[PDB]
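User: Can you model how hexane sits in this protein?
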Amino acid sequence: SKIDFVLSVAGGFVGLGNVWRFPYLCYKNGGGAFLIPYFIFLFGSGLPVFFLEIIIGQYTSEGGITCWEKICPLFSGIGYASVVIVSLLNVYYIVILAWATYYLFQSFQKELPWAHCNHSWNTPHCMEDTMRKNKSTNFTSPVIEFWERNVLSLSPGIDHPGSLKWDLALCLLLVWLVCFFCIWKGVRSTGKVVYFTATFPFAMLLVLLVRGLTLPGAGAGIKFYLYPDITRLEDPQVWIDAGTQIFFSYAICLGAMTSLGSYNKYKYNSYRDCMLLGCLNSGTSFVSGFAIFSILGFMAQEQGVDIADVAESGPGLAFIAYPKAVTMMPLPTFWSILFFIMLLLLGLDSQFVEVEGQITSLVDLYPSFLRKGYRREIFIAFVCSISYLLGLTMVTEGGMYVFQLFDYYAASGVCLLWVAFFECFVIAWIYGGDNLYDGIEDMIGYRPGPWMKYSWAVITPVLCVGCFIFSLVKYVPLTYNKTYVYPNWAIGLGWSLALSSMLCVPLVIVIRLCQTEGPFLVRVKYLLTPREPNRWAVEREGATP
Ligand SMILES: CC(C)CCC[C@@H](C)[C@H]1CC[C@H]2[C@@H]3CC=C4C[C@@H](O)CC[C@]4(C)[C@H]3CC[C@]12C
Ligand SMILES: CCCCCCCCCCCC
Ligand SMILES: CCCCCCCCCCCC
Ligand SMILES: CCCCCCCCCCCC
Ligand SMILES: CCCCCCCCCC
Ligand SMILES: CCCCCCCCCC
Ligand SMILES: CCCCCCCC
Ligand SMILES: CCCCCCCC
Ligand SMILES: CCCCCCCC
Ligand SMILES: CCCCCCCC
Ligand SMILES: CCCCCC
Ligand SMILES: CCCCCC
Ligand SMILES: CCCCCC
Ligand SMILES: CCCCCC
Ligand SMILES: CCCCCC
Ligand SMILES: CCCCCC
Ligand SMILES: CCCCCC
Ligand SMILES: CCCCC
Ligand SMILES: [Cl-]
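Assistant: Here's the modeled complex, given as structure tokens:
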């Protein structure tokens, strides 16, 4: 049937990129004007690049970096670019789990601290959500006050780091301690039975979806979610966010799908897997968007404010809407523990794979010094120790702004499109899209349609290049919560994170040509020759020509 096939592919597609990132990127970019580029990218580059990464991984049986070594010795810097991207992602991504751990710890009491605002951290302008319309014109919300004046202690700006938050600092250590021990002891990403680690996130989502859709104001929120705005489409930013939100959700361009695809058998039909997993992953984001955008509709009518100004147009919308949802449920404390355990579980499985993803890449990149044993065990703590130290800048009072810089630049925006464009440029144009099908029809048993070939050859390069050009022409600098303008150096620092990964592609190109000897035309030609991509003879595998 189909349930066994769904059980076969497990439930690792859903992550924090679906329940935390997509809700606020859609919220930041107006309403439904995010969905049009979202689906355009999903069906033009998202699924095509995802299947391309999986099919290369299973074609070469090689990880993130060595796969490019086999496919095209030139442009091999895509692996190192993916390594830098995943390193910065690991640095700033566990901060979300630190926030989730802090929320979970604070939820272990009789009364949820963010239900009412009568505590020390609350601004005198706070008013209860019910009392805002039941009876200094701007009145802030008790949920927002907990997030900004307790969890974040937001400082006037990124130029005011303030004092390190010790309560958050320990929480950032605990998740790294959890991540350190699990990776070092070889613990599987999903613990014991995978059923609980997979069905529980869905079970809580339907609980939140049912509550959200039943809320009195949910009608307005869904209209905001779905009905698009043509004017917002002219902005090149919404195409940057939607294009890379697909890439973030699918964990492509990170070198993780290629490693995941390397374990598939040569005669395995991954095409149905990628199509199913892609639709399930994006289908969750669209469906879970209904849950969170229904709460905002209820929140907006409760406070008598616009939907676009009811919450934070940045990270922490899932830490503002979802904690608000669990407050309007029977036994609110019980659901808050469950949601933030689900939120913690979803991040941990993603972080276990990615941190081990680079650690496996890093040790294999530099052997003879990272031997499996006393050398690897100290290395695992080394990566975690350094990633914890760089992650400590996002724990300070002004750490929220640094987190937004990393979210916008480190593993999103132009850096992700830079890798995705070069993956499709090498395969479709240098290697040849037709040459890849000759492998695929041998591999999955049947040659696919012309969708994939006409997506790597034209659609993805046009989408990636077109977004990059118009973002530079209509350059709008990054802002946090649509009211804070970043200092010029901060954008320069943010661009360095994007440039550090992007510069890997041209730098390795220079390195390879200088290393090789001979005529330049022969030199570049030699580095463009695939080193027997599928050299495996263990399985009934045909030769590349
Ligand atoms: C590209 C250049 C010209 C931009 C302008 C930089 C100049 C104006 C200098 C003057 C004062 C400087 C700031 C002084 C103190 C700190 C606190 C530290 O924790 C982070 C850097 C930060 C925030 C500095 C950033 C750079 C800064 C703003
Ligand atoms: C539009 C980009 C064209 C790039 C041409 C690459 C040709 C690859 C030849 C490989 C010979 C082994
Ligand atoms: C031959 C491999 C060279 C890879 C270089 C990676 C550069 C990463 C850091 C970018 C500048 C800080
Ligand atoms: C040492 C390198 C000498 C060659 C420099 C590049 C020449 C490129 C010519 C391209 C003609 C199509
Ligand atoms: C909008 C859906 C686009 C699908 C293109 C054709 C699919 C062929 C079979 C996967
Ligand atoms: C390393 C942080 C400072 C870098 C400033 C120069 C880079 C500007 C990129 C646009
Ligand atoms: C091989 C890349 C390791 C991490 C480099 C990070 C540079 C900012
Ligand atoms: C009475 C408050 C209990 C909070 C426990 C966890 C603190 C991070
Ligand atoms: C037309 C693009 C202008 C960008 C200016 C950026 C200065 C920090
Ligand atoms: C390569 C893009 C240029 C951005 C300039 C930003 C300067 C702070
Ligand atoms: C609503 C946009 C759809 C794009 C093609 C699937
Ligand atoms: C925009 C998606 C196109 C898929 C069919 C060529
Ligand atoms: C529909 C009433 C119950 C709300 C929580 C699911
Ligand atoms: C109060 C019931 C509303 C149902 C909306 C799906
Ligand atoms: C792309 C979403 C369309 C919803 C109905 C206009
Ligand atoms: C929250 C429901 C998820 C459904 C994915 C197909
Ligand atoms: C208008 C409510 C739609 C719900 C889809 C899951
Ligand atoms: C920059 C994150 C740590 C790499 C060793
Ligand atoms: Cl997504």
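A couple of observations from the model: The pocket of hexane (ligand 12) is lined by residues 40, 43-44, 451, 454 (CB under 6 Å). The chain has one domain: 3-527.
User: Helpful, thanks.
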